[PDB]
């Protein structure tokens, strides 16, 4: 039982944080978190003691690049003012050349924050979803096709040519109701579950009308049934799915903390996907390169934005907030190791100790204690809302579109009729004045 | 004949209870309850007289860790001051080392107390729900709009003025069926999937009719599919029926008595479901860990609070408050036994006595006597799966409101025609008197 | 460390059973189960040793009623041939008077086996489910009611009386299409989404027809939406729910093992529900009173039958087989205690030991190890089957019923018309021969 | 310059591999793979020559409990026969006590190997599914039946023979519209929710029509509601995506290698999800615990088997077999490191070397080189939510089969009328030649 060990440590949530209680200045009980619970079972396997001491700089450690000076915790490991450095101190090439790390107690990497998909604006259309766009086109080609065959069959069939005007029998007038215009109007009216004023006689034409009724009944029942499936089981999806899916889109925008461990990866990279991801950030600096992790979560949360930080911080924030999600897998591969002065014998002993608690399964149990939050999967048979102008509303567009198209056809009917009346009258403006007065008579006859 | 026995009890209810009556100075006639009826029947078959005596405190028994000594009824037993403890004194491992219980006379455990679900109150006019209130107004404005467009287009188009009376050909009259009243009746009849007796013949009016048919096909398929979603997700709504169903939720919060036997179970627990239940309550142990059972029941009423207590008190308060119910089975499993000093020659004679009263069904009849009180107006018609008068309901109100409105219009048609009839021949009223006559003819003449 | 303890034990699953392996005659390792794992942690808390020995009778123990002789395990406890009796040996009044039991390690009682509900025959009807039977009656009273008002409004309105035969204008004929027969035919045809040949003019009657179309559209959309809820979420239920629900029905039938611990409860009972349950079994002996537990499970499984055994055996069988379920709660209240000779000091030591393992939570962990099976909740979004003659099929009944009713009305139309033709002809059999030839002309005219 | 270093490896792939080539007698040019590329790049920056040497056995290393000594590559290190072990030698707590690893060059864990879902093959004519094949036949027999009943009832009823040509009143002709062809056309048009041009007028035929309207209202509402159920439950079908999703199931069975590092994890586990996974596999440890990784992959193909192995081999075989996939993330967390004797002056120089190759991205480029092979034809269009040509499909076949059938009937109508036309005036063919002429008139005349 020698003298106590000085454990240098920075404050990070959920790694090391102050306890929320009264009666201040506990002393060695002022702290809790993951690294405090990790230190407790290191003091059970090995034998040593505390005076957990915070770093007087609030930094991890880096290179001054002119002085040759080290900062943060690792400056307190070079000059022997501390003994251990149980903290999120990542194992790096430039750090291992000046201190010693144990084997990792936590793996991590670079991943993506993005706002969780919501299903608030599916489109002012997308009542049109439950049938594929091939099916919406194939029912026009069926409706145009059946209407053309119904015109041909009705002219070719003898039993469709009947005697009109049964008031006066024994005449020599013979009519056919199926014109070309009336044959489209049968197929459109049957398709809309409405029925037209004319109905096929002459059994060859009733098989056409009868098989088009069975086609129509299945199509509309399949539209209603698949729409009820969409409105009951809401299955949402994200625009982006990986890093290369973010490497192509320009609408969603990138982002990382400036002068951090994540920005240095994309600067030094040579992968063609990750080289494109840095040509963005080198151009659009002061607009995507945030200066802290706490600020960059807000720009995901407010703006339309995707943020690049470490994966253990994503796994902590996305348990607290339910607006947020993780996109894709991992990009880098790093580890958190217990710092140690160079040449110290405590490196190989903690390496034994971490591997013991890993086989027992206690590092998994510590992490589940400090990273699980409320969780919010919400496990709910998706709460049905009233259907509104953000769900349907394209039918209000195509209704007003078809009522504008009908005014143009009404003028084209008015000019073509007035051209034929002017064939027995003056040039063009006589019959334009003759016909427009008749509607201004405001009477039922003539 | 020997000395009478001194028995300690404790003022919990229904166990012992001051008898609400006048005329004081009783002996042990002050007391009544379950444990008084049990001590009466144990006396008649073992042959002893007894003197009931409340303990000092209102404490069952616990070991003060500082003093190392016990308090309450287990202190009266261990000091040989009393020799029976007929009370809700739970058989515990720490209590069995200092006194001797008999075999149990009552079996219990930990269960969850929660408010009975108030219901739905579906809000007759609940059929109006699958669409937004703006959607019901926009469809009502679209039907008035299309009917005003169809009136103008069919008026100005020359191809709608056909020849009426085709039974007399080669006459010279033209008639437009699309009046103002007939244009609303096209749009109403197309909206309701029915079909009016009049059909568009020009191409300009077959665009208005054809695009209004596609509008109503989407609206009615959207109403049916979304109403299917509302009715499917509420059959998937299952109420909470387990402690594990409380584990996944954070909306309904837990609660227990601080420093009780129920709270002690969740600390020592190693079940992962019950560990999450303590990971909840250890975080919020200023709001949810209530002081007493009386305060915990009041919070189940005036909150969304779920309370954890023993099963015998849940089975007592839910017989006397039909707002409350019991969710789930039993979590723990313990029992009540009478208390004796260690080495007493009565832990075996009472075990014979309790087993004799269990074969004869007297323990069951004593529990029905004191735990059932004033049977509930419960009336479980909760299964409620079919649509009923409380569900649709209001489609009969708007029906009967429409039948009354049409009678006032039929009076207006009867008076406006008769006033025009009395404009030419009659004066005011004898035209109306003879018009009631022709309508009273029992045939299709006049 | 004295001599070894002789533990007498019977074979029961999942209590004590032979291990399934080769290399026979292990010796003290030939057994496993619940009671073997219970003995293992009794030998950890206390200190003793085995020679687990089976009973040479295969019984528990009872009274010979003439010899005064005891059988089973408890005969080996009276005569000191064994030391402990770790087995399902229930604590009974007649057993405690001759041996000693510890405190219970397992609670149990009497409950009910019954076959799990299936949803195979919902009825040849019960397409009629999604609306309540009040709603099915209120739409007849609406259809009969609207048809009566439509008859009254159309006769009272002037604008419904129109001029027929537009071939010949300027006439003095005035017709009304709304008879009493035609007014029911409008309301029936509108209700079935079909439309009749006549349509209301005269705005007061169009409000009647327009508000009946909106009534019809909501009713049929609500039928289709609630039927889709029933076919998606299959929520089954049982005929019986408790013991008193079995105390009234005569279709499902009772049953218990003859001359067992469960039959003796219903014989000795005095509760009015349980007294009725024995008047059945005393009458219908050799038909419901089975003679083993293994046979009585088959009669639940094959016949229509409800079986009364112990609840721990129900909780074991219903995890193995998925056809079976448990009905209601518990009826009796018993316990399994470790047997012990009278006056032995090992009773109070095991009582300490069982209460220690209960506070640690190990009896719950042993029971979950030996009673959980596959479980089969099946957790499946209920597999939709094709709809068949066991689901619908009542519509095939009411179709054939209405086609038989229509033949009776066709004769009643034929006799009433032939009565009116015979008013201008002979008595009754002239016009019966006149009319029947006209249909045998097989021609379109006359 | 010093002695060359002796490095032990082991024949696993992609790690070391005999180079498939002719011309034997190589040195260490026999070998290629990931660990050969790693040992090459560690040599160029640490400056040493090396001789590769397979170990003796094909064993990594394990401690025989009888002998107390090690075997395999860890035996070559502990006896100082070799001094490098560049191999998949996982860093283990028991291995770290006898040798010295470097920091990891590869991170891995336990994951689940399972066959990629083959799909649906919906079976075009899949719209025919919500009703039984007997139901589709009984509706087809009911439509033929009601149409034969309606023909007989409307013939024999006197109230159907109305007066045709009402435009000429007081004539003496009667006509029945219900012919045989018109009676099928009523029943087909009522079945398809359309409306034929003919309506029943007698009460006997309005019972046939009114009960056939109620039949088709239930049939079509049953088709739509049951098709909504089929399409809703398959959107609730989610594939297995976790180890916990395997825990609830017994249909898909587990599997691992007996006496491996993966099997050892589930024995020592205290997670309740993983304990059920071992409670499965310890029961069935003759079928599912397979001998090798090669036999376990073959059982994933030709069974419903899910296999538990390390992540690097799952990521290798799923790049070369698109029938296979990886479910879930990682369960364990371990790593591969090079092996040194205890106290060797190379565990630190290689840790510098591996961290240098990780900053320069060379470890990532070496893993892409040997784990990606011949990129998959994957083509994930699995989202497949809308109904498409593979879903309905066959309603276009039965449409086009009905359009072809009607052309053969129109030829039969053209020949039967002309043969009756050539019965009176013409002989055989010149009646048919002039009938093609009148149908070729571009107007409604002849
Ligand atoms: C059961 C019914 C039977 C009756 C059928 C009757 C015929 C019906 C014919 C339907 C034909 C339509 C085929 C288009 C399908 C592709 C969808 C699309 O890309 O939309 C996109 C383009 O946004 C748009 O412009 C909407 C698509 C065209 C609408 C304009 C014509 C209205 C169609 C009706 C004509 C009315 C008149 C016809 C009748 C008189 C917007 O969709 P989104 O979701 O917001 O964005 C994601 C797009 N994505 C999902 C593809 C990725
Ligand atoms: C969207 C629709 C709009 C159109 C509406 C049109 C009017 C429709 C009028 C419907 C009126 C029917 C009301 C009965 C409701 C009670 C159910 C019942 O008890 O059934 C039981 C009795 O078994 C039977 O006999 C069936 C009930 C009567 C059927 C015979 C008349 C046919 C009804 C149609 C008339 C056709 C002619 C009318 C049209 C020309 C069997 O049901 P179960 O499930 O097997 O057993 C459990 C019973 N339980 C669930 C109650 C516990
Ligand atoms: C493309 C737009 C702008 C103009 C199209 C003009 C079309 C729709 C017009 C011009 C000529 C018209 C036809 C002229 C004559 C007749 C005969 C009559 O008994 C029925 C209507 C019918 C058959 C018309 C139908 C509509 C018609 C074909
Ligand atoms: C109850 C069954 C057995 C017999 C009922 C007889 C009923 C349905 C019959 C007998 C008299 C019949 C009416 C006699 C005359 C006419 C006038 C005609 O222009 C339309 C049909 C109509 C209005 C008939 C409708 C049907 C009718 C009312
Ligand atoms: C195409 C082959 C296989 C079938 C036989 C030809 C069919 C289509 C023909 C042959 C006899 C024909 C019928 C003969 C007489 C009449 C009466 C007339 O007022 C209406 C048409 C009607 C009812 C015909 C309909 C068509 C008909 C049924
Ligand atoms: O800094 S390390 O000890 N060595 C380098 N790497 C590797 C990429 C394999 C990793 C990967 C994951 C870690 F947790 C640690 C390390
Ligand atoms: O205090 S006891 O006599 N022994 C412990 N238990 C057990 C559940 C085993 C129970 C369970 C219910 C009781 F009523 C008594 C007891
Ligand atoms: O045989 S016992 O020890 N004493 C009698 N009873 C009771 C009815 C309370 C019970 C109830 C449950 C048990 F587990 C044991 C017993
Ligand atoms: O053998 S290690 O160096 N130390 C233990 N673990 C840990 C998960 C903490 C891991 C995890 C991944 C590795 F690559 C190495 C190791
Ligand atoms: Cl006892
Ligand atoms: Cl190391
Ligand atoms: Na170092
Ligand atoms: Na005791
Ligand atoms: Na006894
Ligand atoms: Na080591
Ligand atoms: Na539906
Ligand atoms: Na649904």
């Amino acid at each position: 039982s020698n003298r106590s060990l000085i454990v240098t440590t920075i404050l990070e949530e959920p790694y090391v944080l102050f306890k929320k209680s009264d009666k201040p200045l506990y002393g060695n009980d002022r702290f809790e978190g993951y690294c405090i619970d990790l230190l407790r079972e290191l003091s059970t396997i090995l034998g040593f003691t505390y005076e957990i001491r915070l770093v007087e700089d609030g930094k991890y450690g880096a290179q001054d690049d002119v002085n040759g000076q080290w900062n943060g915790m690792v400056r307190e490991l070079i000059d022997h003012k501390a003994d251990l450095a149980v903290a999120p101190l990542a194992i790096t090439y430039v750090r291992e050349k000046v201190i010693d790390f144990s084997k990792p107690f936590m793996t991590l990497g670079i991943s993506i924050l993005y706002r969780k998909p919501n299903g608030t604006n599916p489109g002012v259309f997308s009542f049109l979803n439950p049938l594929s766009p091939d099916i919406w086109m194939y029912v026009l080609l069926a409706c145009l096709g059946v209407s053309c065959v119904l015109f041909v069959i009705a002219r070719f069939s003898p039993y469709e040519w009947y005697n009109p005007h049964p008031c006066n029998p024994d005449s020599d007038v013979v009519e056919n109701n199926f014109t070309l215009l009336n044959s489209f109007w049968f197929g459109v009216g049957a398709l809309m579950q409405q029925g037209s004023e004319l109905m096929p006689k002459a059994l060859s034409t009733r098989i056409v009308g009868g098989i088009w009724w069975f086609f129509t009944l299945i199509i509309i029942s399949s539209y209603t049934a698949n729409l009820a499936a969409f409105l009951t089981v809401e299955r949402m999806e994200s625009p982006i799915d990986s890093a290369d899916d973010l490497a192509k889109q320009t609408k969603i925008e990138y982002g990382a903390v400036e002068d951090g461990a994540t920005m240095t990866f994309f600067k030094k990279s040579k992968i063609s996907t990750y080289d494109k991801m840095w040509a963005f950030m080198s151009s659009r600096r002061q607009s995507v390169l945030v200066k802290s992790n706490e600020e960059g979560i807000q720009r995901v949360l407010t703006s339309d934005y995707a943020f690049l930080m470490e994966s253990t911080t994503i796994e902590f924030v996305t348990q607290r907030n339910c607006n947020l999600t993780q996109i894709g897998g991992l990009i880098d591969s790093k580890g958190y190791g217990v710092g140690t002065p160079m040449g110290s014998p405590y490196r190989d002993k903690i390496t034994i100790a971490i591997l013991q608690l890993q086989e027992e399964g206690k590092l998994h149990m510590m992490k589940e204690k400090w990273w699980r939050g409320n969780g919010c999967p919400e496990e709910e048979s998706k709460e049905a809302s009233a259907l509104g102008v953000q769900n349907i509303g394209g039918i209000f567009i195509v209704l007003a579109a078809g009522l504008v198209l009908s005014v143009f056809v009404a003028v084209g009917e008015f000019l073509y009729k007035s051209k034929k009346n002017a064939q027995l009258e003056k040039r063009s403006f006589c019959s334009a004045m003759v016909e427009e007065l008749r509607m201004s008579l405001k009477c039922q006859r003539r």
Side-chain angles (χ1 to χ4, degrees), chain A residues 96-101 342 347:
Chain A
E96 183 68 28
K97 291 175 71 174
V98 74
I99 62 169
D100 289 334
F101 289 92
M342 182 177 285
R347 179 183 69 185

Side-chain angles (χ1 to χ4, degrees), chain A residues 105-404:
Chain A
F105 59 91
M106 185 175 285
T107 64
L108 70 155
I110 297 170
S111 182
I112 306 169
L113 272 174
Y114 185 68
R115 188 175 177 89
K116 189 181 287 185
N118 205 0
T120 303
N121 296 116
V124 72
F125 293 95
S126 74
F127 60 92
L128 201 66
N129 286 330
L131 300 179
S132 68
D134 294 330
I135 296 299
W136 292 105
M137 292 296 173
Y138 289 163
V139 298
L140 269 74
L141 272 299
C143 181
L144 295 175
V146 171
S147 299
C148 290
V149 179
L150 184 65
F151 179 73
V152 173
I153 296 298
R155 298 289 182 181
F156 185 74
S157 178
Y159 293 98
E160 187 67 33
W161 291 93
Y162 68 98
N163 191 1
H165 308 288
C167 69
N168 205 168
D170 292 331
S171 180
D172 202 1
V173 292
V174 171
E175 283 180 353
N176 202 164
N177 287 321
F178 287 102
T179 65
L180 187 62
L181 182 62
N182 289 320
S183 295
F184 290 107
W185 184 246
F186 181 78
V188 170
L191 185 62
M192 298 299 168
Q193 296 290 322
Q194 293 290 327
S196 66
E197 71 271 15
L198 59 42
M199 194 63 63
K201 293 179 260 73
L203 175 62
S204 67
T205 61
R206 286 182 176 176
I207 298 171
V208 174
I211 201 67
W212 181 249
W213 286 349
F214 183 74
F215 180 81
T216 299
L217 186 63
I218 300 299
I219 290 297
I220 298 174
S221 297
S222 298
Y223 177 74
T224 307
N226 198 11
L227 181 62
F230 286 182
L231 295 175
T232 304
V233 181
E234 186 177 3
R235 187 173 65 237
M236 295 174 284
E237 72 272 14
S238 67
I240 56 173
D241 192 75
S242 176
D244 56 352
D245 289 331
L246 215 163
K248 294 184 286 185
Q249 188 63 41
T250 321
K251 182 179 180 180
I252 40 92
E253 63 184 1
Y254 298 74
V257 176
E258 185 178 2
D259 292 331
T262 305
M263 191 191 79
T264 313
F265 179 75
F266 290 98
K267 184 185 286 186
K268 290 174 69 176
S269 179
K270 293 182 185 293
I271 301 170
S272 66
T273 300
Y274 299 147
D275 198 2
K276 290 176 68 67
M277 295 182 73
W278 179 246
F280 190 90
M281 297 177 185
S282 64
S283 68
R284 298 185 185 179
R285 192 174 289 175
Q286 286 74 237
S287 64
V288 296
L289 291 177
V290 80
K291 67 187 289 184
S292 68
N293 285 319
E294 294 179 353
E295 188 184 2
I297 295 169
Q298 296 294 321
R299 292 186 62 184
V300 180
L301 196 64
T302 62
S303 176
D304 182 71
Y305 187 85
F307 187 59
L308 289 166
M309 56 162 71
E310 293 87 5
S311 66
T312 57
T313 309
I314 291 170
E315 289 177 352
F316 180 72
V317 174
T318 58
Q319 297 294 320
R320 296 295 186 271
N321 195 1
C322 303
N323 306 122
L324 297 171
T325 190
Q326 179 176 359
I327 299 299
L330 274 71
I331 299 168
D332 202 2
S333 181
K334 294 185 287 185
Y336 285 156
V338 174
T340 288
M342 182 177 285
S344 176
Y346 292 99
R347 179 183 69 185
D348 296 330
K349 292 175 71 68
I350 297 170
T351 298
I352 293 295
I354 296 172
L355 288 171
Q356 183 178 3
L357 274 64
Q358 180 64 39
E359 295 291 327
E360 294 175 353
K362 290 184 179 293
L363 275 77
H364 183 70
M365 291 295 174
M366 292 176 185
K367 186 176 176 68
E368 294 292 325
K369 185 168 71 175
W370 293 100
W371 272 260
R372 294 294 93 191
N374 294 319
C376 58
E378 296 292 326
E379 197 61 29
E380 198 262 335
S381 66
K382 295 280 99 175
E383 183 179 0
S385 181
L387 207 66
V389 298
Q390 70 271 12
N391 293 318
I392 60 174
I395 48 173
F396 290 96
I397 302 301
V398 305
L399 180 65
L403 266 64
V404 169

Side-chain angles (χ1 to χ4, degrees), chain A residues 434-435 437-446:
Chain A
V434 170
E435 294 293 326
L437 293 174
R438 189 264 304 277
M439 290 69 168
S440 296
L441 262 296
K442 293 182 181 179
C443 59
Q444 292 180 356
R445 273 75 177 174
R446 296 296 298 163

Side-chain angles (χ1 to χ4, degrees), chain A residues 90-98:
Chain A
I91 300 169
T92 317
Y93 173 72
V94 296
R95 291 176 181 174
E96 183 68 28
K97 291 175 71 174
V98 74

Side-chain angles (χ1 to χ4, degrees), chain A residues 70 73-81 98-99 341-342:
Chain A
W70 290 91
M73 291 183 285
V74 304
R75 178 63 179 170
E76 294 179 353
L77 274 307
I78 296 167
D79 295 332
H80 296 86
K81 294 183 285 184
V98 74
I99 62 169
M342 182 177 285

